RNA sequence: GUUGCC
DNA sequence: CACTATTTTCGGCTACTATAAATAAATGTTTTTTTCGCAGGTAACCCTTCGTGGACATTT
DNA sequence: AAATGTCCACGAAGGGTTACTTCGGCAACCGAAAAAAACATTTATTTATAGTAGCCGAAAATAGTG
């Protein structure tokens, strides 16, 4: 949506007065034409106390998930930060409540986990590295090296800052002389 | 196609940014094609938003700008980069926020929401200007505050230069360099302005169009004797006032 | 102060605003302005939402007058949660010490529901039998900690079905704004007591 | 204060 | 007469809902101050300019 | 000398400008805008209740078709 010109035989190298301005609605109206049309039934909009309040329906847990839940709770004490991404589209809040409701549901199966203070049955070696094979890079030094690049760009724009400043005072000092 | 556009911008960046180019030398410089397809790649180069169209008065003029600022403005959207062109067109004296609204027709909310993001992109700062105080003035980081200093403590400069003449304009300029005075730039015009305030106070006198002699306020400093004149002012109804005739 | 007079002149139009949309009779609006005026002095309005604090202020004068206007109708048009509006209602009513305040009698809500319930011409017999059911609802132990709009929507459900069949479990929800499965329990609550 | 009428 | 076919219904599972109490930190919302808004009906009757003639002045 | 050149002030004519048009009585009825400042909420974490309310959902069950 840049400005457009044309080449007349009468006046060559003339620029279009209508392309100088933009309408800001023709682009919006294209997609609004290509939206689905439905006829509102005033019964459909019904609302109750369960409206406009955050919280949703949790997808109930399966036993295939529990072996990735018990063992992630067997390795660490109780660490909700890194186990969240293990269940990729589950969030930090409802998985904390999954720790809470199991206290009343299975109080004794949890009580075996904190007694276990040792490396467990050695089958987590795959799940040790299945977590690691996502974006394989030395993260203990990957964050260091590009952070040093960032302050290098900030130092160069700081060099560009003062070198712009010194020539500016130099130029208008000459205007003060004249 | 592309290679013809790669040749022309290397010619635009060939010269130093001044000496603003035009067509009458461009067809002398790049005239291997006719004007019908030369314009079509320049309008395509306008579609690649590198070339801009600057104005010397009453006639058609061109100006190429560097690729470094072209990439960072391509990150913005249509309206985001559009308002960024107005501030960089101003450049040296800033631009007033209400006048920016006048040149867009975008109303007060959509312009302020745009530049709120733009300061976080570190392309625009806000300065305080004095020829119209308390107005919003925006510039780049290129720092042109062309608009001595307005706030006080001129008297610290002023009270010392009386002492140099008390014992008895070019003779001042060597004296003001020393004595660790908190100054950054002086000029012979400033000392001429700094001296005539004392002329209005009759602290010293102007003779022979540049010389200065003291009006002997030193004996008044230490009927025309307003010091040591303390009044009674209490329990005396018979006093004289300068007001209370109106 | 001029800004003191200006900040309530804006607050006058806001009370003038929502009273129009809720069909409030105007002798509550001017009475509700007295609540906001003295609650202005107690430093309660600073920080909180202006569009919220007038909604709780107007609702107090709705229940001193004992009208049919229940709280969630205020929450609907600003498209916010109900529990936000009731939160500042509790945090207000403690601070300026409202002691006397009438109970939300659910008997009010029946005879206002019938006009929008598009029922037959015999609209007085459908509410006379209902208030006999509503006083039968009262001495029996169904609603003591439950919702007023819940049980007041269950009594009109039973009276409508025993003469008409206009009840669809949905039209009375479109009036009472309480969900469908929470009222199915209420007739099973009534059935085996 | 403003209109209508004899 | 019988295995279906969708429904009716419980049903447990979960997600909030005031409650007091600590920060510490950040955010978001609203009065109270201190401060300049762009062309770049009839009839006196007094008011202004038009005009015309006053005597000084300077040349012949 | 003197005649014309010139300059000057009072008056003439019209110029637009400003307060003007019954006497009764009955009914009624009505600036904005940035900054400074204050302060609640969200941000967790408990840990006890009952209630909605949603979503499911499977399994209880009468029912629909061959």
Curated annotation (Swiss-Prot), chain A:
Keyword Transcription regulation in record: yes
Listed Basic and acidic residues bias regions: 161-170
Span list, region Disordered: 161-178
TM ranges: none
Location in or out of the cell: Nucleus
Gene Ontology MF terms: RNA polymerase III general transcription initiation factor activity; TFIIIC-class transcription factor complex binding
Signal peptide (UniProt feature, chain positions): none
Keyword ATP-binding attached: no
Any one GO cellular component localisation term in the record: transcription factor TFIIIB complex
Domain of life: Eukaryota
Keywords attached to this entry: Activator, Nucleus, Phosphoprotein, Transcription, Transcription regulation
Domain spans labelled SANT: 56-107
One record GO biological process: regulation of transcription by RNA polymerase III
UniProt family annotation: Belongs to the TFC5 family.
Subunit structure: TFIIIB comprises the TATA-binding protein (TBP), the B-related factor (BRF) and the B'' component (BDP1). Interacts with TFC4.
Function (record text): General activator of RNA polymerase III transcription.
Protein name (record): Transcription factor TFIIIB component B''
Residues shown, of full length: 360 to 537 of 594
Curated annotation (Swiss-Prot), chain B:
Location within or outside the cell: Nucleus
Role summary: DNA-dependent RNA polymerase catalyzes the transcription of DNA into RNA using the four ribonucleoside triphosphates as substrates. Specific peripheric component of RNA polymerase III which synthesizes small RNAs, such as 5S rRNA and tRNAs. Involved in recruitment of Pol III to the preinitiation complex. Involved in the configuration of an initiation-competent form of RNA polymerase.
Lineage of the species this protein comes from: Eukaryota, Fungi, Dikarya, Ascomycota, Saccharomycotina
Keyword Oxidoreductase listed: no
Keywords of the record: DNA-directed RNA polymerase, Nucleus, Transcription
Top-rank taxon, per record: Eukaryota
Impact noted for substituting residue 150 to H: Cold-sensitive. Abolishes interaction with BRF1/TDS4
Name by which UniProt lists this protein: DNA-directed RNA polymerase III subunit RPC6
Phenotype upon changing residue 125 to A: Cold-sensitive. Abolishes interaction with BRF1/TDS4
GO terms for cellular component: cytoplasm; mitochondrion; nucleoplasm; nucleus; RNA polymerase III complex
Family matches, as InterPro entries: RNA_pol_Rpc34 (IPR007832), RNA_pol_Rpc34-like (IPR016049), WH-like_DNA-bd_sf (IPR036388), WH_DNA-bd_sf (IPR036390)
Binding partners and assembly: Component of the RNA polymerase III (Pol III) complex consisting of 17 subunits. Interacts with BRF1/TDS4.
Originating organism: Saccharomyces cerevisiae (strain ATCC 204508 / S288c) (Baker's yeast)
Family: Belongs to the eukaryotic RPC34/RPC39 RNA polymerase subunit family.
BP-aspect Gene Ontology terms: termination of RNA polymerase III transcription; transcription by RNA polymerase III; transcription initiation at RNA polymerase III promoter; tRNA transcription by RNA polymerase III
Pfam family, one: RNA_pol_Rpc34
Curated annotation (Swiss-Prot), chain C:
A GO CC term attached to the entry: nucleus
Key words, A-Z: Activator, Metal-binding, Nucleus, Phosphoprotein, Repeat, Transcription, Transcription regulation, Zinc, Zinc-finger
Transmembrane intervals: none
MF term (GO), any: RNA polymerase III core binding
Sequence repeats: 18-94, 113-192
Superkingdom in the source lineage: Eukaryota
Location, primary (coarse class): nucleus
Cellular localization per UniProt: Nucleus
Any single biological process term in GO: RNA polymerase III preinitiation complex assembly
Record text on subunit structure and interactions: TFIIIB comprises the TATA-binding protein (TBP), the B-related factor (BRF) and the B' component (TFC5).
Membership in a protein family: Belongs to the TFIIB family.
Further comment found in the protein's record: Present with 4330 molecules/cell in log phase SD medium.
Summary of the function given for this chain in its UniProt record: General activator of RNA polymerase III transcription. Interacts with TBP. Binds to Pol III subunit C34 and to the TAU135 component of TFIIIC.
Name of the protein in question: Transcription factor IIIB 70 kDa subunit
Origin species: Saccharomyces cerevisiae (strain ATCC 204508 / S288c)
């Amino acid at each position: 949506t840049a400005i457009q010109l044309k080449l007349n035989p009468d006046g060559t190298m003339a620029i279009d007065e209508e392309t100088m301005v933009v309408d800001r609605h023709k682009n919006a109206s294209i997609e609004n034409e290509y939206k689905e049309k439905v006829d509102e039934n005033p019964f459909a909009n019904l609302y109750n106390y369960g409206s406009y309040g955050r919280g949703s329906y949790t997808d109930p847990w399966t036993v295939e998930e529990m072996i990735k839940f018990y063992k992630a709770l067997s390795m660490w004490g109780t660490d909700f930060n890194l186990i969240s991404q293990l269940y990729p589209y589950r969030s930090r809040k409802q998985v904390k409540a999954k720790f809470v409701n199991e206290e009343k549901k299975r109080p004794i199966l949890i009580e075996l986990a904190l007694r276990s203070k040792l490396p467990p049955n050695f089958d987590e070696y795959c799940c040790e590295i299945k977590k690691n094979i996502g974006t394989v890079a030395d993260f203990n030094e990957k964050l260091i090296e590009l952070q040093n690049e960032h302050k290098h760009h900030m130092k160069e724009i700081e060099e560009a800052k003062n070198t712009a400043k010194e020539e500016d005072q130099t130029a208008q000092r000459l205007n003060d002389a004249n | 196609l592309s290679d013809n556009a790669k040749t022309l911008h290397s010619q635009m960046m060939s010269k130093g940014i001044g000496a603003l180019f035009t067509q009458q030398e461009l067809q002398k410089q790049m005239g291997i094609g006719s004007l019908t397809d030369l314009m079509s790649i320049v309008q395509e180069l306008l579609d690649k938003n590198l070339i801009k169209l600057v104005k010397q008065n009453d006639e058609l003029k061109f100006q190429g700008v560097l690729e470094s600022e072209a990439q960072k403005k391509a990150t913005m959207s249509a309206e985001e980069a559009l308002v960024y062109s107005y501030i960089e067109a101003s450049g040296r004296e800033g631009i007033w926020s209400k006048t920016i609204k006048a040149r867009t027709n975008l109303h007060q909310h959509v312009v302020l929401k745009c530049l709120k993001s733009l300061e976080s992109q570190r392309y625009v700062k806000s300065v305080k200007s004095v020829k119209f105080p308390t107005r919003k003035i925006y510039m780049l980081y290129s720092l042109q505050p062309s608009v001595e200093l307005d706030i006080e403590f001129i008297n610290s400069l002023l009270t010392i230069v009386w002492r140099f003449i008390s014992e008895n304009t070019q003779e001042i300029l060597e004296f003001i360099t020393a004595a660790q005075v908190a100054n950054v730039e002086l000029t012979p015009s400033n000392i001429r302005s700094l001296c005539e305030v004392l002329v209005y106070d009759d602290k010293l006198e102007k003779v022979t169009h540049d010389c200065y002699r003291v009006t002997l306020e030193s004996i008044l400093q230490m009927i025309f004797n307003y010091f040591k004149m303390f009044p009674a002012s209490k329990h005396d109804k018979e006093v004289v006032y300068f007001d209370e005739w109106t | 102060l001029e800004s003191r007079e200006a900040t309530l002149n804006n607050a006058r139009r806001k009370l003038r605003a929502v009273s129009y949309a809720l069909h409030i009779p105007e002798y509550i609006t001017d009475a509700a302005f007295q609540w906001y005026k003295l609650a202005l002095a107690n430093n309660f309005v600073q920080g909180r939402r202006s569009q919220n604090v007038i909604a709780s202020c107007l609702y107090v004068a709705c229940r001193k007058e004992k009208t049919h206007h229940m709280l969630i109708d205020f929450s609907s048009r600003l498209q916010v949660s109900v529990y936000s509006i009731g939160a500042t209602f509790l945090k207000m009513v403690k601070k300026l010490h409202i002691t006397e305040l009438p109970l939300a009698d659910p008997s009010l809500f029946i005879q206002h529901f019938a006009e929008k319930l598009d029922l037959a011409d015999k609209k007085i017999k459908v509410v006379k039998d209902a208030v006999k059911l509503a006083q039968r609802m009262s001495k029996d132990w169904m609603f003591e900690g439950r919702r007023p709009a819940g049980i007041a929507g269950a009594c009109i459900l039973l009276a409508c079905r025993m003469n008409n069949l206009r009840r669809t479990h949905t039209e009375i929800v479109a009036v009472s704004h309480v969900a469908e499965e929470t009222l199915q329990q209420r007739l099973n609550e009534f059935k085996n007591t």
